[PDB]
Amino acid sequence: ASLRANDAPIVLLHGFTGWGREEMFGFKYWGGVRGDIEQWLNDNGYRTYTLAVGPLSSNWDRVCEAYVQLVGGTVDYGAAHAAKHGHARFGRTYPGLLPELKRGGRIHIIAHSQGGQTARMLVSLLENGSQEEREYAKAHNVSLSPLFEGGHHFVLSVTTIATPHDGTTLVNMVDFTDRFFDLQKAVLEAAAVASNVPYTSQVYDFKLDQWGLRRQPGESFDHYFERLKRSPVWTSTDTARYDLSVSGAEKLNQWVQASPNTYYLSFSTERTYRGALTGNHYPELGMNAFSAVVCAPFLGSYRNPTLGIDSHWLENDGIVNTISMNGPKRGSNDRIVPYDGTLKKGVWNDMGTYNVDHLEIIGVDPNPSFDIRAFYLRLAEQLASLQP
Q: Is residue 304 within 8 Å of residue 142, measured between CB atoms?
A: no
Residue closest to Ca ion (Cβ): 286
282 backbone dihedrals φ, ψ, rounded to 5°: -130, 150
Residue 61, interface with Zn ion (CB under 5 A)? yes
Catalytic residue flag (residue 165): no
Q: Is 270 annotated as a binding residue?
A: no
Residue 365, interface with Ca ion (CB under 5 A)? yes
CA–CA distance, 149 with 156 (Å, rounded to integer):
19
Report the residue number, 299 or 343, with the smaller CB distance to Ca ion.
Answer: 299
CA–CA distance, 318 with 207 (Å, rounded to integer):
26
β-bridge pairing 336-338 and 155-161: unpaired
The residues near 89 (Cβ < 8 Å, ≥ 6 apart) are 76, 77, 78, 79, 82
Q: Is residue 346 within 8 Å of residue 261, measured between CB atoms?
A: yes
The residues near 76 (Cβ < 8 Å, ≥ 6 apart) are 64, 68, 89, 90, 91, 145, 147
| Active-site entry in 36, 317, 334, 350 | 317
- Catalog residues that contact a copy of itself under the rule CB under 8 A: 85-88, 172, 174, 210-212, 231-232, 235-237, 239, 241-242, 273-278, 280, 282-285, 368-369
198 backbone dihedrals φ, ψ, rounded to 5°: -75, 60
CB of 89 to a copy of itself, least distance (A): 10
User: Angle between the 59-71 and 115-128 helix axes, to the nearest 10 degrees?
Assistant: 70
Q: Is 360 annotated as a binding residue?
A: yes
Residue 238, interface with Zn ion (CB under 5 A)? yes
CA–CA distance, 313 with 168 (Å, rounded to integer):
9
CB of 280 to Ca ion, least distance (A): 21
Partner interacting with residue 61 (select from Ca ion, a copy of itself, Zn ion, none; CB below 5-8 Å by kind): Zn ion
Partner interacting with residue 211 (select from Zn ion, a copy of itself, Ca ion, none; CB below 5-8 Å by kind): a copy of itself
CB of 235 to a copy of itself, least distance (A): 5
| Active-site entry in 108, 112, 281, 358 | 358
> Which residues in 259-288 contact Ca ion (CB under 5 A)?
286
Catalytic residue flag (residue 358): yes
| Active-site entry in 57, 58, 113, 124 | 113
| The only residue of 57, 118, 253, 367 in contact with Ca ion, by rule CB under 5 A | 367
Catalytic residue flag (residue 113): yes
Q: Is 153 annotated as a binding residue?
A: no
131 backbone dihedrals φ, ψ, rounded to 5°: -55, -45
DSSP class of 74: E
Positions at the binding site for Zn(2+): 61, 81, 87, 238
Active site residues: 113, 317, 358
Question: Which chain residues interact with Zn ion by CB under 5 A?
Answer: 61, 85, 238
Positions at the binding site: 61, 81, 87, 238, 286, 360, 365-366
